[PDB]
Symmetry: D2
Subunit: 355 residues, 4 copies
């Protein structure tokens, strides 16, 4: 036990708002990181049913608000899905309309069902189909909706709200007159900045985020097929392409990156771990994944977590069909702050034991 002299010294230190470093929990400087976030897998059958169920059970108040957010069991206090990333599933009918606002939190919206979905980002209107995603970067006036001719749409939102909050950098304001006014032609952004290695001769665009705000499923699929003709990709991800800011080559946003990967028929990757958090969405196909020993058998439009520094591998159970996983992450924040670390699994042939 401590000496009456020591216990008097710690008490003296507290009086001046100080302490002894030998008195704290030994993992103030840990040998390696250990995630507080736990691996979770969300079944599309459950999500579609419970989100649509919300329409008839929601009050006149709390318009939306009406989101089924993915709560990590170990991340309940900050309502995050993985690490410092927020994710919610939401729905709207044709003609429905949410007012414009801006926040310091960056966001992306990945459509998983329906047609007619749109987003105005700083006057640039963008229409989205299944497996397309739109960017709404930090500080931009954005609003969402469904076109009048559209169907009922269901999408996933990914934000860095928890990161924005914990860093004490959060800001919010509603549009001074509810909705943005713009005469800029529809889909101007993807149509002008969406060409392969191609940019307007005069680039009047000087913002640190991507000028391309919509990333299309079809051309991305087409490009992965092309990548399949010339490379095997990585041992840990297969044919993996990351989305870019075409002005810089860097990530689409300052805090968030996104990727799309293709797994060949019967392919089973090796396992690795890294310092970022990753949230996967199954854009196409059927298979399973092992993350932290736990097995997740996934189908089209399922969602699953991979916490930081957690062993993870992927597998396509289809016999003659490729599988495509969309994913977004906090990679840019890792890379910019020099915290990016990666390590392969040496045990087995590079594969986790499933219990």
């Amino acid at each position: 036990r401590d000496t009456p002299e020591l216990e008097a010294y710690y008490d003296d230190l507290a009086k001046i708002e100080t302490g002894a470093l030998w008195t704290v929990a030994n993992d103030i400087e840990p040998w390696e990181p250990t995630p507080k976030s736990a691996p979770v897998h969300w079944k599309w059958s459950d999500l579609r049913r419970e989100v649509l169920r919300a329409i008839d059970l929601v009050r006149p108040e709390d318009a939306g608000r009406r989101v089924v957010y993915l709560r990590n069991p170990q991340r309940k206090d900050v309502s995050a899905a993985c690490g410092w990333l927020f994710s919610g599933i939401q729905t709207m009918k044709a003609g429905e309309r949410a007012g414009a606002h801006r926040h310091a939190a960056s966001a992306l919206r990945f459509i998983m069902e329906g047609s007619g979905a749109y987003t105005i980002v700083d006057g640039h209107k963008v229409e989205l189909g299944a497996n397309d995603f739109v960017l709404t970067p930090n500080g931009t006036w954005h609003e969402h909706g469904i076109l009048e001719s559209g169907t009922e749409c269901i999408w996933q939102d990914g934000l860095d709200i928890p990161l924005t909050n914990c860093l004490e950098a959060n800001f919010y304001e509603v549009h001074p007159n509810d909705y943005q006014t713009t005469d800029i032609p529809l889909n101007d952004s993807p149509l002008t900045y969406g060409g392969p290695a191609l940019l307007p001769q005069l680039d009047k665009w000087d913002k640190p985020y991507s000028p391309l705000l919509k990333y299309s499923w079809e051309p991305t699929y087409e490009a992965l097929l092309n990548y399949a003709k010339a490379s095997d990709g990585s041992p840990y991800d297969g044919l993996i392409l990351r989305y870019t800011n075409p002005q810089t080559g860097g990530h689409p946003m300052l805090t968030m990156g996104a990727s799309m990967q293709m797994l060949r028929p019967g392919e089973h990757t090796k396992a690795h771990r890294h310092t970022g958090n990753v949230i996967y969405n199954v854009a196409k196909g059927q298979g399973y994944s092992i993350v932290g020993g736990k097995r997740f058998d996934w189908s089209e439009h399922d969602i699953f977590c991979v916490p930081a520094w957690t062993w993870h591998e992927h597998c396509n159970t289809q016999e003659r069909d490729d599988a495509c996983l969309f994913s977004f992450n906090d990679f840019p924040v890792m890379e910019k702050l020099g915290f990016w670390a990666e390590q392969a699994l040496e045990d087995n042939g590079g594969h986790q034991i499933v219990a």
Copy 2:
């Protein structure tokens, strides 16, 4: 007051079964309009600080000798042991003979000398010598050891670390040197002597690290730079004549996560109040005066330490009649700047001065 329907409550429980929830059930948005400081402003008098740090020598056990450091503990940040925001700060003491072993960690560190002479650090083979008000960098993942040269005196210094940030972001690594100490034949002070020149770099620059090649930042030349700056400008209305330390190779910040500044307040100067999104820890390098942080007045003198939480009104004052005052600071800024979270705002009311809340 009014409980919502059993239908809704069945739905909430159904959502919990698949590890989800209804967003309208939370409550609360912690005010998304503007940041809420999680740290409290705190002052640390050098009188108390120095006196309590020396006491640790005779009280520390056989073990805990390597951990013999008094850390600045923010009363609202005890859970993560931060001094302010996601920044760690500690006070150490070593004597003429003493030296420590070398380790490497993901966290970045600053070592600002407060008292003494002939302190030294080895960073990846680069040996640097330090005096009062000088500081060194021990950046991400670099081999670093501390000690005092034979000809030196008893030293007291302040450590600055982004430890809470690194743990928080789940990215901290640690390993001791396999040989306990580093073996280096590189000439002494090679870094500040090759990279410390005013707007000058070696013609063939072989440095390939994202952080500064200049690892020691010297008090004397910094002070002389501020005297010169004073001849041509009044600087910022909110800090006086304020220069930030830089990475001479890129012109950016010294380290990827922490920035550092030195500022000179003219005799009798009272600065204007402002807010910003970073967390800043101040060490008084020279002089005497006060500061008002979030309503609280901190009368400081040489080597006092105080911090300013994010989005908190702050202003600085030099009480002296003839002599200038200098405030060293290290901060959170590179993380706010790179992630696009930087914001600043001036106090409009009361002539740019806070109402002092006793």
Copy 3:
């Protein structure tokens, strides 16, 4: 008229003895107010071009077989053999079987296919296949060889080189491959298939060259990109809908010295005239019309070549009623942009159209 004093003339000769002169003796400042084009605008009809290039096959000796190329010679730039400014351009022909050896040089090159199918180039092991209106890069100091695949036809292509610039700046190097040809097992078209995706890069990018990882730029997807661009904009008043090719890894230009553009002119479009500091060489990828360069009218059609000297008024027109016209171009721009020499100016007079000087 009036000779200056023998005292002055003794002084001038004294200055020459130490290899100097009096600045007031020159005369002339070549007009320092604005640039003077050193190149003349020139048109090259495909009819003549193709016809004269094929003739070279039977006329060339045993030697000179490797040099069998008709270069575009600017009449006011014969001394340095440039097509326009400091840019070289030539026309080559190869048949289904033929292939050349590999060499490496400091100059950068573009190879734009004008006629034929199944052309190929190896760049540092990267094998690419080319069709009409596609082009490849053979950047600074890279191992490159050209040829036609077995299944291909007779090909005619245009080479674009910064040879005059490199000689002018005294920096050109040359060496043949020690093994005559390159040995590569890398899968065909690996570069455009891994780097040709719309806003997509391999998660682990291992390319570490200052120039583009994407070496083949394809006509078909470029054309489809312009049709899409047309749905949302009218582009520039001076070029119509104009996209430049980029380095997908940095977002900058494809090579450190040469830029390249493709532009689509809507049916019946007459563009506005402008000046700029670069030199541009145009190849007609699709359609028919005319252009006015420095007063001269050039009625062009598919695969005609013309250049625009620096600081020369130029405008483009599409004569067709239903179909769009496309103009490929490669240019000097990266050198003007990086050295801070870029300047542009619009024609104010005559509704933005030049007076055509017959």
Copy 4:
């Protein structure tokens, strides 16, 4: 000889402004560069005498204009000193004054004698002493003069006029009202941006050239002495420091770089060659240099050329005194356009044979 068929073919090619590549001089693509510029050495005794001599022999017309430009024998047509660089020696008395103008050509002015010399660059006034140099970068309003209390001053001008001209990028205009109007404090630039690894917290300066426009001799000398305590420098240059843009770490200007080197007592460097042109000015000391086999015995304030791809080495003949060479160059244009190449001499111990 050529066949009547061939000579008719070349004639046909000329009619359409074309030629045969096998008919041109073989060194269109040379194996390596060979400089047209020749090594030259200008003696300070000659320069001081002939420049001062110009005052009494110049007409009322041609005010200045009154410059003794260093003409390379092989570069007479473009009036360059080396490669594409212009250099002239000029003088002014106290109170003398040249009007403000701007040009696309970048320039630097290296003071070699006298006191009171000044330059206003875009409102920023800068005073210069011996061995100090001021930048007047592309497109900036600049004017020169000597303070009323100053002495007779002699300086060297270094410009990239020939480069600006050959690239067809030259522009010029006189100030709409002759002289710049500014209330910005004297020496504001060196005093605010001249600190070692130190910049103002808010940097309102967004120009691609250096915010530090004056580089001082004394602190640069002081820094070379410090560099001498910890390194041997390069085998080919000794203790060589290059001047920087302190906002970027890059070169002070877009087309021009500058360096200052210290040679230790009795030091004799090895020889190398590179793709840039370099013009040296002897800021302090006495010694010799070998460039292209030719020996140049230099003294304080001498000037000498080193053409591109020409072997060059340096030597301090002083027994117990360091020698300092100032130099400026076209290195940034080489580096930015990827034309930078360097090669050591292997013959001898790395030393040229003097004939």
